[PDB]
Design an enzyme around this catalytic site. Structure first.
Site, PDB file in Angstrom:
ATOM      1  CG  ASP A 172      -0.718  -5.065   2.585  1.00 37.72           C
ATOM      2  OD1 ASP A 172      -0.022  -6.079   2.376  1.00 37.72           O
ATOM      3  OD2 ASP A 172      -1.638  -5.054   3.423  1.00 37.72           O
ATOM      4  CB  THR A 205      -2.653  -7.994   5.597  1.00 39.87           C
ATOM      5  OG1 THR A 205      -1.872  -8.225   4.419  1.00 39.87           O
ATOM      6  CG2 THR A 205      -3.170  -6.525   5.619  1.00 39.87           C
ATOM      7  CE1 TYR A 215     -10.578  -2.760   1.613  1.00 40.87           C
ATOM      8  CE2 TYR A 215      -9.035  -1.149   2.506  1.00 40.87           C
ATOM      9  CZ  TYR A 215      -9.332  -2.169   1.616  1.00 40.87           C
ATOM     10  OH  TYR A 215      -8.379  -2.595   0.721  1.00 40.87           O
ATOM     11  CG  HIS A 258      -0.599 -11.803  -3.054  1.00 44.75           C
ATOM     12  ND1 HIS A 258      -0.118 -12.880  -2.344  1.00 44.75           N
ATOM     13  CD2 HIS A 258      -0.987 -10.886  -2.134  1.00 44.75           C
ATOM     14  CE1 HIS A 258      -0.190 -12.623  -1.050  1.00 44.75           C
ATOM     15  NE2 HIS A 258      -0.742 -11.429  -0.893  1.00 44.75           N
ATOM     16  CG  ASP A 273       1.437  -5.751   5.816  1.00 43.02           C
ATOM     17  OD1 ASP A 273       2.164  -5.444   4.839  1.00 43.02           O
ATOM     18  OD2 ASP A 273       0.298  -6.277   5.688  1.00 43.02           O
ATOM     19  CG  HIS A 274       3.240  -8.983   4.813  1.00 40.75           C
ATOM     20  ND1 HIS A 274       3.260  -9.039   3.429  1.00 40.75           N
ATOM     21  CD2 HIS A 274       1.975  -8.656   5.167  1.00 40.75           C
ATOM     22  CE1 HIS A 274       2.063  -8.717   2.968  1.00 40.75           C
ATOM     23  NE2 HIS A 274       1.257  -8.491   3.999  1.00 40.75           N
TER      24      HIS A 274
HETATM   25  N1  LIG Z   1     -10.571  -3.454   5.802  1.00 38.80           N
HETATM   26  C1  LIG Z   1     -10.346  -4.367   4.826  1.00 38.80           C
HETATM   27  N2  LIG Z   1     -11.370  -5.074   4.296  1.00 38.80           N
HETATM   28  C2  LIG Z   1     -11.189  -5.994   3.332  1.00 38.80           C
HETATM   29  N3  LIG Z   1      -9.978  -6.286   2.827  1.00 38.80           N
HETATM   30  C3  LIG Z   1      -8.876  -5.639   3.268  1.00 38.80           C
HETATM   31  C4  LIG Z   1      -8.983  -4.624   4.316  1.00 38.80           C
HETATM   32  N4  LIG Z   1      -7.725  -4.166   4.556  1.00 38.80           N
HETATM   33  C5  LIG Z   1      -6.892  -4.843   3.717  1.00 38.80           C
HETATM   34  N5  LIG Z   1      -7.597  -5.721   2.962  1.00 38.80           N
HETATM   35  C6  LIG Z   1      -7.021  -6.636   1.969  1.00 38.80           C
HETATM   36  O1  LIG Z   1      -6.802  -7.900   2.588  1.00 38.80           O
HETATM   37  C7  LIG Z   1      -5.470  -8.355   2.271  1.00 38.80           C
HETATM   38  C8  LIG Z   1      -4.990  -9.369   3.283  1.00 38.80           C
HETATM   39  O2  LIG Z   1      -4.483 -10.535   2.641  1.00 38.80           O
HETATM   40  P1  LIG Z   1      -2.929 -10.861   2.654  1.00 38.80           P
HETATM   41  O3  LIG Z   1      -2.339  -9.663   1.931  1.00 38.80           O
HETATM   42  O4  LIG Z   1      -2.813 -12.202   1.933  1.00 38.80           O
HETATM   43  O5  LIG Z   1      -2.577 -10.762   4.142  1.00 38.80           O
HETATM   44  C9  LIG Z   1      -4.683  -7.058   2.183  1.00 38.80           C
HETATM   45  O6  LIG Z   1      -3.423  -7.203   1.545  1.00 38.80           O
HETATM   46  C10 LIG Z   1      -5.667  -6.115   1.475  1.00 38.80           C
HETATM   47  O7  LIG Z   1      -5.636  -6.282   0.069  1.00 38.80           O
HETATM   48 ZN   LIG Z   2      -0.223  -7.191   4.010  1.00 36.98          ZN
HETATM   49 ZN   LIG Z   3      -0.899 -10.294   0.738  1.00 41.30          ZN
END
Ligand SMILES: Nc1ncnc2c1ncn2[C@@H]1O[C@H](COP(=O)(O)O)[C@@H](O)[C@H]1O
Ligand SMILES: [Zn+2]
Ligand SMILES: [Zn+2]
Ligand SMILES: *[C@@H]1O[C@H](CO)[C@@H](O[C@@H]2O[C@H](CO)[C@@H](O)[C@H](O)[C@H]2NC(C)=O)[C@H](O)[C@H]1NC(C)=O
Ligand SMILES: *[C@@H]1O[C@H](CO)[C@@H](O)[C@H](O)[C@H]1NC(C)=O
Ligand SMILES: *[C@@H]1O[C@H](CO)[C@@H](O)[C@H](O)[C@H]1NC(C)=O
Length: 379
Positions: free
Chosen positions: A11, A47, A131, A170, A214-215
């Site tokens: 990620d 994400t 998860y 982050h 993803d980004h």
């Molecule tokens: N199945 C999931 N349940 C809860 N959190 C997740 C899951 N998959 C990923 N995440 C977290 O949610 C984040 C999304 O926030 P962002 O990275 O700001 O898009 C990801 O980077 C992970 O740390």
């Molecule tokens: Zn992400």
């Molecule tokens: Zn993030």
């Protein structure tokens, strides 16, 4: 012996991390495989939406996961990263693990990839993990590779997901090179563990492996804040998602809310839903709220008590800072080839081709990926 494919996401792996830090293990993986230096991902660059685009080949307005936090006004349902298990939110598309699972004598496997613990169109992978971010990479790796190696019927498609370097990106911000270097070295080590493991199990030469993300991530700052509380009272609207793309549901005349918000900061664009730029493919879905606010790169939309976050993503998907990369190795892929760019929606038709699956209608262009593939003409 059917083709097998392992799709791996770290990620938040910004493409230009590769140019600014040393990745000896990734370099090795690339040397005998292919590298796409930067992938143009989809708006908004978060994400959940981008992972789903990877496995569906669709823009976010089409697959319906338009943010990490969503509200459907009609059903009154809420979605968030934790609260993400109602199939309602996933069922506007069919991800590749499902199409793969539905073939006779084939299985899908998963280790923590978003949505893989949810039945989608009533189908779940034969093997998956509920998860749990505490589960070590080693455990994710050892299990997904065991499943690929063993398993009857054969596992032909597998996903593997890791929360870094997003989480620490982050925390520190991508410009903190001292701290990010240790984060990214750990990622390179994990890629080394992945390759070591494939070689140990005798998978390295016959398994197709895609390592992608993803980004990216961009630096945020106390000098670059837009405080909505200084621009509009809470009584006017409900906040569905915050930064850097705020999803605004007016409680009163949308016109009144828009007039306030459009005069808040020159460092964001304020769009009525119907005025969201076509280039974003982010209009045609009821899950997109009546107004969105899009902060310029490196700006953060805040409320009075919003906590500091030195790195963020979500911004305009044309920004290099938001782009991930893609690398791949295996019998389907050339050895020692480097390509400039593909779109993230192009990965899906490429994966269906490798696996011999009929793709669902999608927004990707298989042509963009032909130079990566051994059986294909490269112009
Ligand atoms: N199945 C999931 N349940 C809860 N959190 C997740 C899951 N998959 C990923 N995440 C977290 O949610 C984040 C999304 O926030 P962002 O990275 O700001 O898009 C990801 O980077 C992970 O740390
Ligand atoms: Zn992400
Ligand atoms: Zn993030
Ligand atoms: C992305 O691909 C999807 C899937 O084909 C397209 O969705 C279709 O959109 C048309 C509009 O011309 C509808 O008539 C179809 O019913 C839709 N099909 C599905 C399965 O959703 C979408 O239009 C594509 N996006 C772009 C920008 O071309
Ligand atoms: C990993 O595999 C072991 C045995 O191979 C299994 O018992 C364990 O539950 C798996 N871990 C998960 C699914 O998180
Ligand atoms: C998450 O994983 C850790 C390590 O395997 C475990 O101790 C914890 O109980 C798990 N949480 C849940 C809710 O299963």
């Amino acid at each position: 012996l059917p083709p097998k494919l392992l799709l791996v996401s770290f990620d938040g792996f910004r493409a230009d991390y590769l140019k600014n830090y040393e990745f000896p293990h990734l370099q090795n993986f690339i040397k005998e495989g292919v590298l796409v230096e930067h992938v143009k991902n989809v708006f908004i660059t978060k994400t959940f939406p981008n992972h789903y685009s990877i496995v569906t080949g669709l823009y976010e307005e089409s697959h319906g996961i338009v943010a990490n936090s969503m509200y459907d006004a009609v059903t009154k349902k809420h979605f968030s990263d934790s609260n993400d298990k109602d199939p309602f939110w996933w069922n506007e598309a069919v991800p590749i693990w499902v199409t793969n699972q539905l073939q006779e004598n084939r299985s899908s496997a998963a280790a923590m990839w978003p949505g893989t613990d949810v039945p989608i169109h009533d189908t779940i992978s034969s093997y998956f993990m509920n998860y749990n971010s505490s589960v070590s990479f080693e455990e994710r790796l050892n299990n997904i590779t065991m499943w690929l190696n063993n398993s009857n019927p054969p596992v032909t498609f597998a996903t593997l997901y890791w929360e870094e370097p997003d989480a620490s990106g982050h925390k520190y911000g991508p410009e903190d090179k001292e701290n990010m270097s240790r984060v990214l070295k750990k990622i390179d080590d994990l890629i080394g563990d992945l390759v070591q493991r494939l070689k140990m199990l005798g998978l390295w030469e016959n398994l197709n492996v895609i390592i992608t993300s993803d980004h990216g991530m961009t630096q945020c700052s106390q000098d670059r804040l837009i405080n909505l509380d200084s621009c509009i009272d809470h009584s006017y609207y409900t906040l569905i998602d915050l930064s850097p793309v705020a999803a605004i549901l007016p409680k009163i005349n949308r016109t009144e809310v828009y007039n306030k918000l459009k005069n808040c900061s020159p460092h964001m664009n304020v769009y009525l839903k119907e005025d969201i730029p076509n280039r974003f493919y982010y209009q045609h879905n009821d899950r997109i709220q009546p107004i969105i606010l899009v902060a310029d790169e490196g700006w953060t939309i805040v409320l009075n008590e919003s906590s500091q976050k030195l790195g963020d993503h979500g911004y305009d998907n044309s920004l290099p800072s938001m782009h991930p990369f893609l690398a791949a190795h295996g019998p389907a892929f050339h050895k020692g080839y480097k390509h400039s760019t593909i779109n993230i929606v192009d990965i899906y038709p490429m994966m269906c081709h490798i696996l011999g699956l009929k793709p669902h209608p999608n927004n990707g262009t298989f042509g963009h990926t032909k130079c990566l593939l051994v059986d294909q003409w490269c112009i």
